[PDB]
Amino acid sequence: NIPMSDFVVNLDHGDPTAYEEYWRKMGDRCTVTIRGCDLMSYFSDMTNLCWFLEPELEDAIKDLHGVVGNAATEDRYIVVGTGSTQLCQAAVHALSSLARSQPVSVVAAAPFYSTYVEETTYVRSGMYKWEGDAWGFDKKGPYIELVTSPNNPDGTIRETVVAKVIHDFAYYWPHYTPITRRQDHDIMLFTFSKITGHAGSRIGWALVKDKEVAKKMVEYIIVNSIGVSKESQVRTAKILNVLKETCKSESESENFFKYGREMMKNRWEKLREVVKESDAFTLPKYPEAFCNYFGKSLESYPAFAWLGTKEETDLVSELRRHKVMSRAGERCGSDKKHVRVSMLSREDVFNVFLERLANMKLIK
Amino acid sequence: NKNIPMSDFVVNLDHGDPTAYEEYWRKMGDRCTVTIRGCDLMSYFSDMTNLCWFLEPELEDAIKDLHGVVGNAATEDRYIVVGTGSTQLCQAAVHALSSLARSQPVSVVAAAPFYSTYVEETTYVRSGMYKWEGDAWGFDKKGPYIELVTSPNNPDGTIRETVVAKVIHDFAYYWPHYTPITRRQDHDIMLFTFSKITGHAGSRIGWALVKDKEVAKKMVEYIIVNSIGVSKESQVRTAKILNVLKETCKSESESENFFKYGREMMKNRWEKLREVVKESDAFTLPKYPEAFCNYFGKSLESYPAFAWLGTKEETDLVSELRRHKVMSRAGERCGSDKKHVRVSMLSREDVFNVFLERLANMK
């Protein structure tokens, strides 16, 4: 009997549950089987810089970036981590450890991924210091710039605005944004969580050129948790493989990236409608670009909607009093007029959100 | 492959990779098999009903059942926190306790000899929240402090207690196959690792039992920023293994009952090592008192997972040992002297035997 108006829509976080249906249909081809004596050792391969990296995972990463053409993997080291979240902290750690003086400054162009702030603050390390907005940053000494592209929260394609750099390409995949170029920077971060939605696997990988950096990152991960879950690696490798086979299918419900784009496209079009006829809501505009993967020129459909409001309201609060959770813009170095709303929730959750989005400022 | 002389073969007992249990689990067969569907464990969340919302219920239940049957730890009226290995939990506890402290840096110490890895865990990030002060024995510094108690201790395998205000208990090896279960542990922070129990170190799974909710909450938070939780598939597998292990406890077969198989294994290995050392003229091995184990209901010995090897001479034991192609952990790294080394007893059979051969045949 639970009246559906008492139902809280939580789109504050970025739990990519939207892909759950898809993978369920994939069926038994995604199944992972692990014997009782498998993956027991601490080590995977002492022949690699990152010895805790499972071989099958290393191949799956390389093949995937090879087919999608979104990242260069030659002449560099791959480092696996319990998610991109532990890989970023490993890189900040390493770069700071190699700097000529500490604390090293860490900055990011505003608006930025709010989680960056705590990551560079919670342990109170003298190795580095969060300096906020990179725009206009001109403090002296060593610094690390965090470039998220597509960005979190606004989904903007980005580049350095201001000396080391870390590129977080969590959302740099065909179903989110067009592949304008095969990235090839010094430190490129990727997460398994936002590609297929298997966030619970806690798996990310970093592509590092500087061997001395990669070496320190591996060392960081070793002390921090002595490696990453083997079963997670073994599984991530399995589905990424299935996702690769899927890239040569012509079915629209088979080819993941195709399916993904369309799903993202539809949701963004519906949201676009609602915002259109609403009185005070705004939505970021994204330029069209050519995608080297799909071979066409097409729109971007970010995993987060940077919702704004022309009014002088605490949008997060207003949205909250209509039972809609979202990420405060002030947390992303923005203002009370913006909020970040996940676009990767479940279908019914998404629909309910749109309903209330319109039903509001025209009912309270 | 052949033509490689066995004399060029490096015996690495520097690390504590518990590969000795691999044989056992292989024989257990298909009942250990873990199956994961493509659409399972996708969300970041396991259960928002729990303080530690990233803890998978079936793992939580397994941990409690296992402690319930072994009786080595209390689990009532306390929060359970999982982490990517005990190593992550331990750092979560040190962080949490320092966060709640009235002033920083909080002093961190451990009676010598101590688990060398503790030194890097409380140093690598250069945190102003705490400071590694070293040996707990000679600790007279003031203000807030945290003492680390490992029992059975790494490296010497001694049963320990606080010797010097917060405390973290590392009961990595507090299991029937290593040492007798004298009491059902009930301290504020108790750490356990799946790795040293069954040998599944690659799963990266450890858990903490925490009485103070504020500490537990801060520990969870730490893990959230540190890696947003722990691998689901690991939790699911750890749970599967720990269940089988539990069933095994009621078995009579000595090849079936894990704790029976383990202890019998650790016993044999320790006796062969005991012989070798005895007829040696320089090496020394610790002495462990006999005690009554509430699990086995008998009065028996403890056979630690590490051998704290010492020499009466005036040598750099770790050096001489390497000279015979034997890798071990330098006692100096454990806050000891060059006369001691830590040699793992949980390696593979053949590696172990080779070590015994080389050990008796040297000066």
Side-chain angles (χ1 to χ4, degrees):
Chain A
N1 307 71
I2 45 185
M4 195 59 84
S5 76
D6 278 36
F7 195 68
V8 167
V9 166
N10 191 341
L11 301 174
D12 173 72
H13 54 57
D15 199 32
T17 47
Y19 300 108
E20 200 176 43
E21 267 192 355
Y22 175 84
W23 292 109
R24 187 187 303 105
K25 293 182 160 182
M26 287 310 289
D28 305 54
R29 56 187 301 187
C30 300
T31 299
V32 165
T33 297
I34 305 159
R35 298 239 99 206
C37 68
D38 296 338
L39 314 175
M40 287 182 82
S41 175
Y42 270 115
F43 320 102
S44 282
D45 178 33
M46 301 317 282
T47 274
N48 291 146
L49 172 60
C50 172
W51 45 261
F52 51 85
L53 175 53
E54 215 64 33
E56 310 116 75
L57 176 56
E58 196 190 12
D59 296 338
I61 295 163
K62 292 199 171 191
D63 300 335
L64 218 210
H65 289 303
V67 55
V68 176
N70 67 342
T73 60
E74 77 279 352
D75 290 354
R76 66 201 72 207
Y77 310 93
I78 299 184
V79 183
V80 67
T82 79
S84 160
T85 150
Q86 171 191 55
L87 257 354
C88 190
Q89 302 179 72
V92 169
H93 183 285
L95 294 172
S96 302
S97 177
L98 301 168
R100 63 222 327 156
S101 62
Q102 304 174 326
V104 182
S105 285
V106 184
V107 294
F112 47 61
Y113 178 41
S114 70
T115 302
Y116 279 154
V117 187
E118 25 266 77
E119 277 174 30
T120 49
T121 291
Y122 78 125
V123 313
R124 305 179 81 85
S125 173
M127 298 189 293
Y128 49 73
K129 196 174 187 298
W130 179 251
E131 294 302 339
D133 197 339
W135 280 124
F137 171 84
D138 70 284
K139 211 162 181 169
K140 51 280 161 295
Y143 78 101
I144 306 169
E145 174 166 6
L146 309 179
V147 175
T148 317
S149 169
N151 187 49
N152 193 330
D154 64 38
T156 304
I157 297 303
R158 305 180 143 198
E159 270 167 19
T160 51
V161 302
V162 54
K164 299 309 167 78
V165 184
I166 297 175
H167 292 282
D168 192 329
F169 294 129
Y171 304 98
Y172 192 48
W173 295 94
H175 56 308
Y176 293 125
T177 189
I179 310 300
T180 63
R181 68 168 171 170
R182 167 165 168 294
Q183 311 285 24
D184 190 15
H185 298 284
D186 293 325
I187 305 173
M188 304 190 268
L189 269 36
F190 285 109
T191 170
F192 180 39
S193 308
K194 307 299 172 23
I195 304 173
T196 62
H198 291 78
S201 300
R202 304 291 50 238
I203 280 280
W205 60 86
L207 303 177
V208 195
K209 284 187 193 184
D210 190 332
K211 181 191 62 172
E212 218 74 34
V213 174
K215 200 131 80 165
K216 294 282 192 174
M217 285 174 80
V218 168
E219 291 177 6
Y220 171 87
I221 294 184
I222 295 173
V223 175
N224 196 214
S225 67
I226 321 171
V228 188
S229 171
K230 254 56 166 174
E231 27 265 306
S232 262
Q233 302 199 48
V234 169
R235 185 174 177 223
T236 297
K238 186 61 185 295
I239 89 144
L240 286 188
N241 275 330
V242 179
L243 169 138
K244 192 216 306 177
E245 297 158 1
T246 230
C247 291
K248 57 197 65 174
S249 176
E250 32 174 52
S251 182
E252 222 109 293
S253 66
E254 261 272 304
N255 185 302
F256 175 79
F257 286 129
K258 208 293 169 186
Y259 168 92
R261 254 199 99 70
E262 206 68 13
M263 183 214 273
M264 231 36 69
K265 190 163 175 290
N266 191 301
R267 292 192 186 198
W268 263 98
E269 285 180 355
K270 300 172 72 178
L271 170 66
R272 225 93 219 198
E273 280 271 298
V274 177
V275 181
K276 173 79 194 284
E277 44 191 47
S278 70
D279 329 305
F281 299 130
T282 79
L283 232 41
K285 281 188 62 175
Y286 305 109
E288 194 174 65
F290 183 85
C291 180
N292 297 303
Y293 178 76
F294 284 117
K296 317 180 170 188
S297 88
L298 65 213
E299 292 282 9
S300 317
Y301 305 117
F304 292 100
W306 193 220
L307 196 71
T309 177
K310 300 121 174 282
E311 306 188 345
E312 301 307 293
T313 51
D314 195 0
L315 188 55
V316 64
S317 297
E318 288 307 303
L319 249 47
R320 202 134 50 180
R321 56 167 263 64
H322 274 253
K323 291 174 187 154
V324 172
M325 319 285 98
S326 49
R327 182 60 50 83
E330 296 192 293
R331 295 233 285 156
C332 314
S334 189
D335 56 26
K336 305 184 188 298
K337 307 176 194 171
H338 297 76
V339 293
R340 183 201 71 188
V341 43
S342 177
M343 296 287 287
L344 297 183
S345 74
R346 277 189 192 75
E347 265 282 317
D348 41 300
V349 179
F350 179 61
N351 290 321
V352 174
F353 162 61
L354 294 183
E355 204 115 80
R356 310 168 105 123
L357 220 212
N359 227 124
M360 76 153 61
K361 275 301 157 64
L362 293 151
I363 272 147
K364 279 272 163 304
Chain B
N1 65 65
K2 200 76 87 297
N3 294 317
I4 20 71
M6 250 314 131
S7 60
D8 286 346
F9 180 79
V10 173
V11 167
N12 199 340
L13 306 175
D14 176 76
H15 55 59
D17 204 27
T19 58
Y21 299 117
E22 189 174 283
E23 243 274 78
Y24 174 75
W25 296 103
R26 191 206 327 286
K27 290 190 143 79
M28 287 307 297
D30 305 48
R31 59 147 148 182
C32 293
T33 301
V34 186
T35 297
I36 305 172
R37 304 214 102 237
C39 73
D40 298 334
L41 326 171
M42 286 180 85
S43 178
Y44 278 108
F45 316 99
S46 285
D47 168 43
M48 294 314 286
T49 286
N50 272 312
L51 166 62
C52 184
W53 46 256
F54 51 82
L55 170 60
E56 213 66 11
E58 53 284 73
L59 176 60
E60 189 188 16
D61 284 344
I63 294 169
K64 286 186 173 197
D65 299 333
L66 216 280
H67 285 301
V69 67
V70 177
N72 63 346
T75 65
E76 73 275 358
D77 297 334
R78 62 199 73 214
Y79 311 92
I80 299 189
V81 185
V82 290
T84 307
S86 175
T87 136
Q88 182 176 44
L89 263 1
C90 192
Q91 293 176 51
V94 174
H95 180 276
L97 285 175
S98 290
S99 259
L100 300 176
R102 57 181 63 265
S103 58
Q104 311 184 336
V106 180
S107 296
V108 186
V109 298
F114 44 59
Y115 177 46
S116 74
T117 307
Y118 282 152
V119 182
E120 20 227 307
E121 286 183 17
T122 44
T123 305
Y124 79 130
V125 302
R126 306 185 78 75
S127 170
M129 291 164 74
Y130 49 81
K131 191 172 203 305
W132 178 254
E133 291 302 338
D135 194 340
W137 287 112
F139 180 75
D140 56 279
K141 206 152 184 184
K142 334 68 58 189
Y145 78 104
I146 302 169
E147 186 189 15
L148 306 177
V149 185
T150 315
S151 181
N153 178 60
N154 185 320
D156 64 33
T158 304
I159 296 294
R160 298 189 166 183
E161 216 111 283
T162 46
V163 306
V164 53
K166 302 305 170 60
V167 57
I168 297 168
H169 292 80
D170 197 320
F171 295 129
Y173 307 91
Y174 188 51
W175 296 86
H177 56 312
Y178 293 129
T179 192
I181 313 300
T182 60
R183 68 168 169 175
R184 172 168 180 284
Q185 294 300 335
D186 191 10
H187 302 297
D188 291 323
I189 298 164
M190 297 179 292
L191 268 46
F192 284 107
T193 159
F194 177 36
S195 307
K196 304 306 162 27
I197 300 180
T198 63
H200 293 81
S203 295
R204 309 310 319 123
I205 289 275
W207 60 88
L209 310 173
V210 201
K211 289 199 192 190
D212 191 346
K213 184 206 230 284
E214 214 71 9
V215 170
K217 198 169 184 170
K218 282 285 183 182
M219 282 180 74
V220 166
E221 284 173 32
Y222 169 85
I223 295 185
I224 303 182
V225 176
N226 201 211
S227 52
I228 317 182
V230 183
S231 176
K232 256 54 152 174
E233 31 276 278
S234 262
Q235 300 194 63
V236 147
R237 176 145 182 263
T238 289
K240 181 55 181 298
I241 302 289
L242 294 179
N243 279 326
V244 168
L245 162 67
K246 182 188 72 61
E247 296 166 356
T248 253
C249 282
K250 72 238 313 175
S251 189
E252 313 166 342
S253 181
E254 289 170 45
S255 52
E256 266 271 308
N257 182 301
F258 179 78
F259 287 140
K260 213 306 170 169
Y261 173 101
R263 192 187 168 79
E264 193 71 15
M265 177 207 276
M266 294 311 289
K267 190 170 183 284
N268 182 317
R269 290 194 184 196
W270 263 95
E271 294 174 357
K272 301 198 295 180
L273 177 63
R274 238 75 206 229
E275 282 230 303
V276 173
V277 175
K278 187 182 169 190
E279 55 205 298
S280 292
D281 11 286
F283 303 131
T284 77
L285 222 50
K287 294 181 62 172
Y288 304 107
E290 185 185 55
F292 183 89
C293 182
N294 294 296
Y295 180 79
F296 287 130
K298 305 184 180 183
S299 184
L300 60 205
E301 305 254 307
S302 53
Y303 309 108
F306 287 107
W308 189 227
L309 196 67
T311 191
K312 305 164 186 282
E313 334 259 57
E314 291 309 305
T315 51
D316 194 0
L317 188 54
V318 72
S319 295
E320 279 305 293
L321 232 37
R322 278 186 311 230
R323 268 200 70 282
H324 290 81
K325 296 190 183 88
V326 172
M327 322 237 99
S328 62
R329 188 59 56 82
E332 262 177 333
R333 271 153 63 59
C334 307
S336 197
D337 61 24
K338 303 197 207 296
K339 304 184 194 87
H340 292 78
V341 291
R342 185 197 63 180
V343 33
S344 164
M345 299 282 276
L346 293 182
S347 69
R348 227 161 300 231
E349 271 283 307
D350 42 32
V351 184
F352 180 65
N353 293 316
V354 172
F355 158 65
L356 289 184
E357 208 173 302
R358 303 191 177 166
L359 201 268
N361 300 182
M362 62 174 270
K363 181 177 282 187

